[PDB]
Amino acid sequence: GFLSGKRILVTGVASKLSIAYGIAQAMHREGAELAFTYQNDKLKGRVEEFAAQLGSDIVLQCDVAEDASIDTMFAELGKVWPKFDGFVHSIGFAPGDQLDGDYVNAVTREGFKIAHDISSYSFVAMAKACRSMLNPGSALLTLSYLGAERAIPNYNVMGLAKASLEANVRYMANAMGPEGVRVNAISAGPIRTLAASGIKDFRKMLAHCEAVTPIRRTVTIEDVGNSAAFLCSDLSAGISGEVVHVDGGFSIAAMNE
Amino acid sequence: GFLSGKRILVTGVASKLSIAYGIAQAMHREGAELAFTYQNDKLKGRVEEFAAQLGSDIVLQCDVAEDASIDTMFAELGKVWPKFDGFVHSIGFAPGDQLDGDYVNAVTREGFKIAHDISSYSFVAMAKACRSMLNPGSALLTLSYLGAERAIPNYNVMGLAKASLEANVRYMANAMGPEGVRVNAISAGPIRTLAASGIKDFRKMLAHCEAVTPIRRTVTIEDVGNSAAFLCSDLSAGISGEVVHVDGGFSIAAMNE
Amino acid sequence: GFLSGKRILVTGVASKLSIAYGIAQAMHREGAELAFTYQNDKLKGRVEEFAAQLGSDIVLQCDVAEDASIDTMFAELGKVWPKFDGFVHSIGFAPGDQLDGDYVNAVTREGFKIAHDISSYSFVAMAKACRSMLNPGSALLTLSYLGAERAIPNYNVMGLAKASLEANVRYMANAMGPEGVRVNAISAGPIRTLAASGIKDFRKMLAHCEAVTPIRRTVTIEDVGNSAAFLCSDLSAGISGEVVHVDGGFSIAAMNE
Amino acid sequence: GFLSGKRILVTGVASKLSIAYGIAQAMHREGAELAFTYQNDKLKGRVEEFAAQLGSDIVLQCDVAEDASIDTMFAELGKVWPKFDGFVHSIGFAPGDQLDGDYVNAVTREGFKIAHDISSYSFVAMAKACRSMLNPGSALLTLSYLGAERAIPNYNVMGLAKASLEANVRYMANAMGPEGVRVNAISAGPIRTLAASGIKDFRKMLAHCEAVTPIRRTVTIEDVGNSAAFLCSDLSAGISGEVVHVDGGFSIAAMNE
């Protein structure tokens, strides 16, 4: 496949509904060698199981809240992947109280802080820590949301964190391009799922989106995974510092009703 | 390849330096069946020759200045491709007097008109004419330039035409998504070439670009072709109405010096 | 008045409800000396009457479709204002057939032509004609619509025209900057009126807007007039090449329902 | 004055050269009643003196790092202004180590934290504290920089902070709109000063700008003050959630050299 020869590290797998699961599957199908991380002991077994299904046994703990955890993970990856071709950052977080109702009333100093630490800083943290082990032609990827560009109900502070993330993509791209590294983000649409969200009234969001999206449907983790694989392959060599909208055209339309 | 089974029509091939040549090569490598058009008798033989090299013998005349030429071409394609999976619009034009010096002084009613007719209207003209023969899952693609988003010296009126083009992409995406059609544009960087441009002081443009581009180089028709092939494949199903910047991050940086 | 000592030329007044009327009223209130042009005989008296109310007797014909018309209007204007300080361009026209239905179907070569010629080229056309009559510190203004940036049902090719116009603003800005001239555009939201708009199902556009607009109402020609006055005044000295949205935060929110 | 009958609170005055000083001067000139806050004891007298010149004796301390500080400042402010009409937020801070060199290297968890906390969260923090003291028709203003939108050498994490701030503007705009409050930001260009900036090789930023800025000069706190006054006045009633660029067309041109 177009990823054959590539050794990628994938984060934020938590279930078969996880965007990163979809990305992992796709990258594997295009012939990449994958490594996985997990946040805690609660997820360890699920990921190990998924890993194995995708021919991997490089499963490491990483909680991006702790620089030490990041360092230690990269230290262990190195034993087996002294050098590698990048990573997919699919992590995010904020306290629930934060995503409910009036943004001004909801937001707090600490929530803002957490949302931004986990959801935005963490991406560069990882780059900072594995910078030396990345190969030229390596690609870093993160996932964002329209929430960052427009004010979305209930999305509240994640909107801010995402905007920070997308700026991060650009500052990182600029900093690392000269050494062979490309950095982009995929801004995906709300994915239709069964589970339950943090975004309040997500179910509606999905409903409305399908009706007014040019392609007339929500996207899938497949849709998202296919773009990520491309964006992480040498086929995208000319693209860096970009936020690609994978939302079936939702963002470019208006008043479709 | 990821384009296997796909029947694409490619325009604007004029030489081995043509962006569309690069797109054609790439699409062919990913297993698509290609058809070509040519503007006039002066180019007919070169294209026929390229076509053959890419296993095609569907070479038709099309001058997008004439609706009749468009209709007639689509009529003939139909004999052999009653239905097909889209097309790549890589056409553009403006009178030379137009791209030299102060924009206000240079621009004229007629130049503006021509630039916009050929460079922007032509894309929807083609869609209008082959709408009925497109298959669900079909993808339409055009090529644009930063010139459309920023004021670029000498680029003058093409800048306007390009802005019209990029708006066209969105209006077309919105109109055709519901029937299975996706429409995007690639905004490519200035490509390093030997030939001579219409854009005055292009050589400099290339020079400056390489120095301040995050990847530290100009892109290639390969870079561009690889993105187009992806954007025309089912791998991009979740992307429509988008203007993807394939310029190695040039647009996202500033004052790099 | 912050406009005191300015001679500004106002285009496209056609009723007490026209956006240009509101721009005129504000400018006059802020101390500007005004002049008016009208499109054709049928509007002569009306405009002649408004002008009276606005303490002016400078009323000329000008059909932007004709270069000679523009040359002449300025030739005449200069008999009384050999130098002035900016002209407000509130003009645009598409054939109605163009504004209803599927863009791709509705669109036509001629329709496209006319829309851009009148709605876009015209703005530079006038700049070009009075360039030497302008004083340092002059400012040119035009009026856009969100349709330039997003696909909006029925707006169709007007959307492409506006996009072209907004690109014009920057090119013009970049060319006349060094000689003391600023060029900007105001992108107004839909203004609730009683008459009938050439734009299809506009009433609904109105209803929807107020509900989801952050300020919870539609803007007035008053609101628009005021921003207009400011942008043509020395108070906006640091602003050029700008598309200022004056639509109550509408373009920035998403899924407010 | 178009600000007559308004009570506006001004933040971040630290010298005669501070952007807030210029915003104050303009607002005062346009008839606004002003109040000031200072960060710490070391600035008390200075601000107390400016205020005097600006016909005010409302001078309070406020360190946005502390919620209690904000609560108290407003508690005190309310003894004299139980209701007012908007506060101007001209505050931001990063640790210097952060602003020099390779972003990825320079950056650090704490640096990132502080930058966003002070430069971004603070703005909503204040909104949140005086929300009930605000009159219908109030307006909040903040100051950004192009670094939010583009990667700029050395600006580094401040770039992420600003991006976060600009997202805040929209979220805030969308939340307080219905209750009569507008929120906007002015993205100013680099202002030529004599002192020394915490920002690295800034002088050069200055030199470069004037050369390539469409108006061919840097903006003044005067230019910025004026736009500021307007945006906090009823004249800008139709404007909310907006990032107005006040940098002489700089962000819009490309390759002017």
Ligand SMILES: [C]C1=[C][C]=C(S(=O)(=O)N2N=[C]C3=C([C]=[C][C]=[C]3)[B@]2([O])O[C]2[C]([O])[C]([C]OP(=O)([O-])OP([O])(=O)O[C][C]3O[C](N4[C]=NC5=C4N=[C]N=C5[N])[C]([O])[C]3[O])O[C]2[N+]2=[C][C]=[C]C(C([N])=O)=[C]2)[C]=[C]1
């Ligand atoms: C409260 C809350 C939480 C969280 C959040 S986040 O994450 O951020 N998100 N989510 C979801 C969503 C979103 C958006 C929209 C919609 C939805 B977001 O905002 O973003 C997202 C993210 O980023 C990504 C992913 O997602 P998904 O796949 O879905 O997810 P999950 O499965 O859950 O996963 C996640 C992950 O992460 C991790 N972490 C956390 N924390 C941590 C971690 N790691 C390490 N460390 C630490 N500390 C966990 O574990 C998991 O695994 O993508 C995105 N998106 C985008 C777009 C769209 C989407 C959808 N879904 O549709 C998604 C918020 C709130």
Ligand SMILES: [C]C1=[C][C]=C(S(=O)(=O)N2N=[C]C3=C([C]=[C][C]=[C]3)[B@]2([O])O[C]2[C]([O])[C]([C]OP(=O)([O-])OP([O])(=O)O[C][C]3O[C](N4[C]=NC5=C4N=[C]N=C5[N])[C]([O])[C]3[O])O[C]2[N+]2=[C][C]=[C]C(C([N])=O)=[C]2)[C]=[C]1
């Ligand atoms: C004067 C002048 C002319 C022209 C023009 S255009 O075309 O538009 N262009 N070119 C170039 C350039 C540009 C931009 C930038 C740079 C450069 B533009 O603006 O755009 C472009 C286009 O669109 C496309 C393509 O290109 P290329 O590939 O290079 O080209 P060629 O080879 O030349 O080819 C073209 C074509 O077309 C055709 N046509 C015409 N006309 C017509 C036609 N067809 C049909 N009909 C009619 N009527 C011919 O024949 C040929 O084949 O892409 C683009 N780009 C973008 C970006 C970048 C680039 C580079 N190169 O770098 C490109 C202008 C002015």
Ligand SMILES: [C]C1=[C][C]=C(S(=O)(=O)N2N=[C]C3=C([C]=[C][C]=[C]3)[B@]2([O])O[C]2[C]([O])[C]([C]OP(=O)([O-])OP([O])(=O)O[C][C]3O[C](N4[C]=NC5=C4N=[C]N=C5[N])[C]([O])[C]3[O])O[C]2[N+]2=[C][C]=[C]C(C([N])=O)=[C]2)[C]=[C]1
């Ligand atoms: C069918 C058609 C379509 C369109 C047109 S227009 O003009 O272009 N428009 N209208 C309306 C509207 C719009 C948009 C949106 C909405 C609505 B549009 O597109 O735009 C507009 C314009 O531009 C301006 C102003 O308007 P108004 O004021 O409303 O209107 P009127 O009153 O009618 O005025 C106009 C004018 O122009 C003129 N012209 C024409 N042609 C010509 C002229 N002049 C000279 N020459 C020539 N050739 C007449 O006469 C008159 O005065 O603004 C805009 N806007 C924007 C935004 C918003 C708005 C509202 N309304 O809301 C508006 C056409 C047709």
Ligand SMILES: [C]C1=[C][C]=C(S(=O)(=O)N2N=[C]C3=C([C]=[C][C]=[C]3)[B@]2([O])O[C]2[C]([O])[C]([C]OP(=O)([O-])OP([O])(=O)O[C][C]3O[C](N4[C]=NC5=C4N=[C]N=C5[N])[C]([O])[C]3[O])O[C]2[N+]2=[C][C]=[C]C(C([N])=O)=[C]2)[C]=[C]1
């Ligand atoms: C090292 C560092 C960095 C940064 C900062 S900041 O503030 O942030 N900045 N600065 C400067 C600049 C910028 C940008 C660009 C350029 C330059 B930034 O980033 O920003 C700015 C700001 O925001 C505003 C204002 O500024 P200015 O006026 O210039 O300054 P000053 O005078 O110094 O002021 C400030 C203020 O703040 C305050 N704070 C702090 N912290 C705190 C406070 N308060 C309270 N609390 C707390 N905690 C002090 O005190 C003072 O007063 O604007 C801006 N900008 C924009 C644009 C442009 C510009 C110019 N300059 O050009 C500016 C820091 C550090």
